[PDB]
Amino acid sequence: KPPNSVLLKKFSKGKILELEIHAKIPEKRLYEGLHKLLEGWKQYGLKNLVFNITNMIITGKLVNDSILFLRSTLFEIMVLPNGDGRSLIKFNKKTGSTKTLTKLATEIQIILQKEGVLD
């Protein structure tokens, strides 16, 4: 596994959120659960989901509430190693709303907390 600074090269140009989510499970297990979780949230406004399993990246789109003046929030989520037995999630905002992306981060964190996997 290359260092996290190398792994982060896989993000597109954007703004990496300061909020991170740290888990007590290996990155492969964190990603697998995330993939399953977010696939299930497509009907709730998660658009164009692409699961880059290779790089443990999820890409997708959130939208504002206007049908006339759209504001896409295009995002990338990456899962990275965080020491033996541990991993973390980083959020990259390509475009759009920091508030909207942070909301999604908070919702993921709720589910991880419930599952007892947070670090």
From Swiss-Prot:
Signal peptide: none annotated. It is found in: Bud neck. It comes from the Eukaryota. Belongs to the protein kinase superfamily. CAMK Ser/Thr protein kinase family. NIM1 subfamily. Interacts with septin proteins, primarily with CDC11. Interacts with SWE1 and NAP1. Present with 538 molecules/cell in log phase SD medium. This is Probable serine/threonine-protein kinase KCC4. It comes from Saccharomyces cerevisiae (strain ATCC 204508 / S288c). The lineage of its organism: Eukaryota, Fungi, Dikarya, Ascomycota, Saccharomycotina. The gene is KCC4. The chain holds residues 918 to 1036 of 1037 of the full protein.
